[PDB]
Symmetry: D5
Subunit: 167 residues, 10 copies
């Protein structure tokens, strides 16, 4: 009942990336580290703050050879309008994945079947596609981007050196 | 494999109606005739024209004791923004049902599991909750509101008089 | 649950077509646009007007490269008799499929098991056999032949200009 | 795999009887002897001399307390038109049952699934409902009405004669 | 439920034929037309007029290239003894198949499991082995040998000029 | 699958008994010792010898409070015919049960499915319905009535005498 | 469940045979007529009489090309002990098969699950392995060796003489 | 797989006890401590020193309120004969349970299905019927009666002062 | 697949708590906020710092009406020994649950069957027993006790002001 | 339901052996006699005199070509700490296997699922891998190392002596 050391399934979906639409697949994720950033709904109040704080640390994540994929059950059409409507989302340089069919949310197991929306979940995945650490929060419980960056550095530190030791 | 004379299941969902949110359920539909108007996606190009033409005939449908429920796999949050963004949607006086979990689309059987979006489907339902006639079109094949009004009048004509005859 | 982008199954079928019996199969239907016009029963009062309306629009559908196939649970024998009895049916030029098996009605999912008669349903099908746009009416609710033509014109337009790119 | 001494299932069907449509059920059939006369198709290029032959002896069967029920997969609508077209069926006085849903044909096990038409089958049923003797022929192999009358007369002969019948 | 156009299964069985015992198989039946004449019991208090009546028409059935096969759940020992006891059975020239294991009666669906005896049934079968027409009568309801000949002639003339009646 | 100390199942069947047809049921058999004497077919060569040899010991079996029931897959009509056609069979006084539906043969597990004929099997059964001792022989292997009478006496002796050495 | 004309299954087992232990298998039994003589328990009262009565007819059975195999759920160790403890059992010359695992009793369907003891059952088996004729008796019902010898002679007579009347 | 703290199933069986036959049941075993001493065969060429050795310690086991139950797949007839043949078995005063039906051996899981004999196994059981400790040895691997007594004393002193070692 | 808004199952459990053995059950856990702090193994180098960090924040979590429950697959005997051996563990005031059954690890879905050891996971649970917010780290990736406190503070805030109405 | 003459399944586990961690597998175990010594828990308030008693006789077992493998559900980490804490385990020279995932305990069927701890169980296994004799005790019922040595000595005695052993 956990996804630690589980490979990403084969998938393809629409995305929104720097003012235009693209098609992201499993092949595009391999090679770099990756953070899947699930969130409940577009045109919401709490979500923009979480996405906006992930943008601030996106350059630092880029520096650590890590891509960011924000995921919602909204379509790629809706993401574009959300970027136009709110300046916080317009500042987002990372790719915003669309998941209307729910393949991702169901694979990662973060879909609320009643609401039809993804939980506030985050997943750190290695370049080989293995899930290394993750977090699930219920709606209303906001996240901390700094901690999410720390986990990635911590996991990269263990990936490079086989035998970790305390100071 | 058809829904003629099938009762509506018990359900409850969020809606967008005259600039504010409400909760529509199966009880709210009973008593009047009803047209469920499924469409693929908000912030789209073809959809507004179909919804805008349903608005033009909404007063005439109101006159025939019939409510209109537009359905999409988008959230009620997204419908509000779509009304603000585009004047055609802002003119819509009828309730726009949200179906992110897909309960409606799956019940009526109009969900494309690949796309995660509803087909261009329309359903005419009697006041007792029985499905009387319906239409499913694939994406890109637009609808005609006039024909959809004709079917409702035609079905109401048969509902009132038990033995129909040709001229 | 819906039938969109489902291909026609393999089937053979007896039909009355323009004063003569023939055998239609899936191969004869493929290669050109198809309209499947289901209707409840021969020798009824409400059916003739629908089938007649399609014949008025049939020559136009021939130009649009589309064949019409009327279908009901009656035998082919009954179609010939119905054509001889009434002028409306007698002028029908398109083929009249017979489905006493219910194989078509059941495939299209449009049979009323209680009555053993098909609903007033219309299916638009592409040359590849893919079901593209349809409607299902209860008994008593008639159809509008002009709408079928507009839907076929519309669904053809999309097929030419892939996925509504215009 | 035979129906001897099997009671009729409770059913209801439309019928053309004496220039008018009437519903027939087991209630109506029970209490009197009954012949169920199945045949392939109305408006057949094959001459319906079988139905005519049953009419010739129908008065005989009336006086033996036996009603005749012809059955095919055609509708009651098709029966009426057949009577109006040909004099042979026009003179039919016994009820003509319609079995478009296969209800009766399937119960008796006389439906050819491939053509959707009943075989040339005759069943003699008692007032109590028990099937006493029957006959099943392929399409093209015609029947003899006088033979059916003989079987009825014979089955009645035994029906009365309980005692001193190889007890 | 319906044995029309069903091929004869593979079997062998004992039989009494014109004073001696033989072994009849499915192979021996194919090539000519065949009438399977089932009956309930040898040494029956009910005089076997049915069997004697078939004998009167046997010479005629031979000229129509058809063999007669009487069938009963009695043994072949009993068939011979029954012929030696009564003239009617002593004049029988067609083979009398014994079915103590019930393989024929069960295949044709004519066995009464309670009594362990065959119903008064008659099956007409083609040279290819296809069952073309049949009748099943309750115990005590006699048959008409003439009518079986009529059915065979009808079946044969349809076989001679099949699928070409009224161009 | 030894079938010993299994109770006789509930049934009814037709029989030919001393120039008359009768309906024998389980309740008629119960209350007294019984021997079910299965045989393959009426109007055969070996069967009458065996059945005749049982009739010679029938009066003794009756004195020992035991009834005989001969059983085959032939009907009761055939039993009557075989009785007044053959002298040996006409002399028999015990009930000749018919088993055309094969209920007795199947329950005793003595039916040859190929033939649809019972094997040459003899079953001793107590008054309580309990199957006590039996034999099953192939076709062509004749039986000995004396031996069967001996086995009844042994069964009855054991029934009465408990704690015997 | 009549078991006639069923072939003997493939097995091996221990046995005590004339003052010595042996391993008997199916292949040793095949090629000649055989009688499997089941009995409930060693060191009992009725069993030795029956086994002794078989030894009196063993030389004849041997002349008729038939071997006897007595069988019980007792081990081969117990057979040896019973042989040199009892005079009747010491005199026996045929193989005494042991069936502690119950494979023979279960296959012949002759095991009483309550006791874990075989019934008094005798099975005649042809050289080809085919079970031809048998009897199954309850505990306390003794057998007759003469009758069993007669049934062998009958079985052998039928085997040779085809189309006999 | 593990019989620790499993209650004795309900059973009755024959047994040899000090010159006479008795009937031992589960009821008779409860109330006192119990040792079930399984062994492969009576009249074994392997001298039954194991059984004789248990007898030497029997008087001691009686004073510890424990009964000894030797178990074997041999009958009770054989138990008596084996006692009359050899002094070691003739000096046995504890009951010798016969298990020809294998119910005990199968329950304890000690039967060798191939040979049909019990392994050299010993089970210690409480007055409540709970299996407290046991051993299972292959054929040819002998046992030590002293060590079984040690196990019982250990089990009893734990039972006397249970769940209160080192407060 | 996730465990959000799933109630604690009924269970009993041995624990070492502040220099003494006790028996914790579901009833003792309910009625106040719970943090379940899973960790791989006693007598390891990476675990002490995490458990020690929680003890530093434990008094603050007591004020917030939240109890901490450390869990691993070790026995209760091993927890006492680990407390005696190292000072970091010796100062632990919160109860240390033992899970040699794996009943907790399996319920929380956080056991590594290969190693038979729990992942570095933290579960926040409400007084009603509903799981509210959690995280699952692979072996080797440590945690931040401050974040757990912020999440508990955050999840409590929502619980007071129903469904984020502020 | 017993393990006599069952081969060890192929496995691998961590172990504390002679002041260091080493992996152990069937490869390492095969080729020599083996004793698997299961015990409930490290750091038990119960004195581990059993492990000490095995060490006292370990040199004896070394010279009989037999390695000792102690097993519990504790980790290898816990074994090392137990050796550093108490002198009794500090003197242990034989390998101490760790079974935190229950792999070994479940195979031998000696795991108490309710406590998650192995019973006081001892298994004697041959160089070929076959389990020759074993012992299972409840918690609290202690063992005797000298008895285990005796069983090994006995099982080896038979192992060599193939011929003239009740063949």
């Amino acid at each position: 009942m956990n996804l630690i050391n589980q490979k990403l399934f084969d998938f393809e979906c629409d995305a929104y990336h720097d003012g235009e639409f693209t098609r992201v697949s499993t092949e595009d994720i391999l090679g770099k580290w990756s953070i899947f950033f699930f969130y409940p709904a577009d045109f919401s109040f709490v979500c923009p703050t979480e996405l906006g704080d992930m943008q601030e640390h996106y350059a630092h994540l880029q520096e650590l050879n890590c891509e960011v994929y924000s995921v919602s059950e909204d379509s790629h059409y809706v993401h574009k309008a959300w970027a136009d409507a709110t300046e916080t989302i317009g500042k987002i340089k990372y790719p915003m994945l669309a998941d209307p069919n729910g393949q991702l949310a169901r694979f990662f197991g973060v879909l609320d079947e009643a609401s039809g929306m993804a939980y506030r979940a985050s997943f750190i995945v290695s370049p080989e596609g293995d899930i290394k650490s993750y977090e699930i929060n219920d709606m209303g419980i906001g996240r901390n981007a700094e901690e999410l960056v720390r986990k990635l550095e911590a996991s990269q530190f263990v990936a490079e050196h086989g035998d970790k030791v305390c100071p």
